[PDB]
Amino acid sequence: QVQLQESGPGLVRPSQTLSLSCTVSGASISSGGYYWSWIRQHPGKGLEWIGHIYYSGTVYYNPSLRSRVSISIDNQLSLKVASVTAADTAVYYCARVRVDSVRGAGDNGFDPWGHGTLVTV
């Protein structure tokens, strides 16, 4: 089994760098083809996707939140969303997708999720 545990800093309102981390238990992350996503969910609204990253540095982002967030890997799965003048606090999940074969359409979905952390802003 593979489980994903998060790390929540708490709450900072006046525009500081929101830092998170997701240590993966059960299997290492530099062991093959698996994306590592960061997914939001507003309380009372649908899910929202920030971006995912491969272990070799390549990272896809959301086009709406492109110039604010930053995913990184030091076997930690960090997230460094800044410019929090818009009060988005919602919820931060971690999720893993198996990398598809043809690169065109997604062959797999987010089967192992994290437990979820509640950030406040």
Partner: protein, 479 residues
Amino acid sequence: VKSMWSEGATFSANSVTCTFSRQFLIPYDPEHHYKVFSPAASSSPIMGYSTPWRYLDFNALNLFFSPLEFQHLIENYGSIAPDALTVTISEIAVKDVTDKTGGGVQVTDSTTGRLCMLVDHEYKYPYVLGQGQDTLAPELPIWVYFPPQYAYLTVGDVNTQGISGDSKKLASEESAFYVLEHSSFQLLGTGGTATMSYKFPPVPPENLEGCSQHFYEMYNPLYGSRLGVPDTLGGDPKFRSLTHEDHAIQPQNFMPGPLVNSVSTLTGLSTGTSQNTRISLRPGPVSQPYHHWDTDKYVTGINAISHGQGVGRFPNEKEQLKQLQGLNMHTYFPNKYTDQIERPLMVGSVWNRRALHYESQLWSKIPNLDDSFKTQFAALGGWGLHQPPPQIFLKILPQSGPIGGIKSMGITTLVQYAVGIMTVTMTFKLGPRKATGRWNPQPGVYPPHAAGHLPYVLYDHGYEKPEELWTAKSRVHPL
């Protein structure tokens, strides 16, 4: 006139003509865009283009030869080199789905749809055929081929835009956008046929025969040596002669070949910048083994490729462990001994090759940049040549109705797909087997297995390939 599905090899004392036939399927593209990329690496990123075309990749050797025909190839001949190649696209049945809306799919047949076929005889478009990727052909002639989508990488201009470190290769003046619809296009409707007819350059053979002699042991085991070997060092040499028992200090007139990072058990051996850019040169050069059999077990190397499965499917290079190569082979220097793992080129040298097997490539491509050495034989198996067999690109068409005058009625790409038959023939100039006044029965030619699980045969998708690769050097030369 007779329409035939052709398959089978016909041997001679000269060349063998081996043809196979598969059923291909040009699937669909709901968008005929070009779809650049958006990689956006963060640590030199990549930059590509996704063409809406389908090429086909018949590169490997296990398609032209049946296992019985490969066994007949190994136990009878002593060389192999290709000299001709024709690719015929047989009966085409481009058809359209009508979307039963309650059944979901109803496939009638279309006589007005076509299949755009382009052959790149001028090498105008980038060549992605010979790199060893998981879309080649079915190994058995009963399965359906799905040919891969065409795409390529270019060179752009690395920027740094983001927050922390986000790089992205944007388009430069050297970057290129090859639209394949600026070409000649055999349009190739229902029932149409088309050929390619390539002719291979003169390539050196692959010598499917081992050796019954070590290269460093080619002397008379009696009689000693006419020359001498030092005894004392430090300015007063005092050389002594040799007897017939001096085997570890016998002077050789030819050195062994290079062993640049041959070790045993990431990125392997790798060039690049400081510690993290580090692109891999994974399966070594062609002069090195990455799997053989030492006195107890199988040694497997850092620089190995798996060819499937995992545990791995590696070719047993027993003909490199013989002639002074191998994995943990250090070289020693008496400099004021220095254990080195890298062996240099050493002006007079012989290193025979990494052996070809049943599932190896045939060609890759020597890149258009100049001053190659030696590059007559590529890694991952195969030859590798300037002007390789050209790529056959296969789009279908974007038939784009209906409209109604103003409206965007329907789907406007309606839906179409094309099935067909590709019959690929290739002739291999075989050389005669080398002579031996041997008196011993040569070792038999059978693919390696362990116990119970036999090689290529159906079991209770059924058909299973052996654990080790079926190499091609099993008869002796005699050097």
